Design a protein around this ligand. Structure first.
Ligand code: NA
Lengths: 27, 21, 27, 21
């Protein structure tokens, strides 16, 4: 399995981990 | 930044959380 | 003069500063 | 992360460049 987090996967990982939270650059 | 740490290389949960908010 | 960089203005600031380096979350 | 440093607070060019790549 690929353990790199790029593009959409990286966005997906931040959604998961950051929660309420938020992160750049979600609207 | 987050691309070199998490995309080019492999990052931990702790590193990834540094990029929240 | 607002010195805060939020949302789309922060994305622009990164386009300007990062140039060819790129940055998350632009392609 | 960058929102706290550059949006909530004011950040420098050096800090901003931290978030490239
Ligand atoms: Na970032």
């Amino acid at each position: 399995v690929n353990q790199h987090l790029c593009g959409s996967h990286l966005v997906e990982a931040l959604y998961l981990v950051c929660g309420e939270r938020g992160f750049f650059a979600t609207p | 930044g987050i691309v070199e740490q998490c995309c080019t290389s492999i990052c931990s949960l702790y590193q990834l959380e540094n990029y929240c908010n």
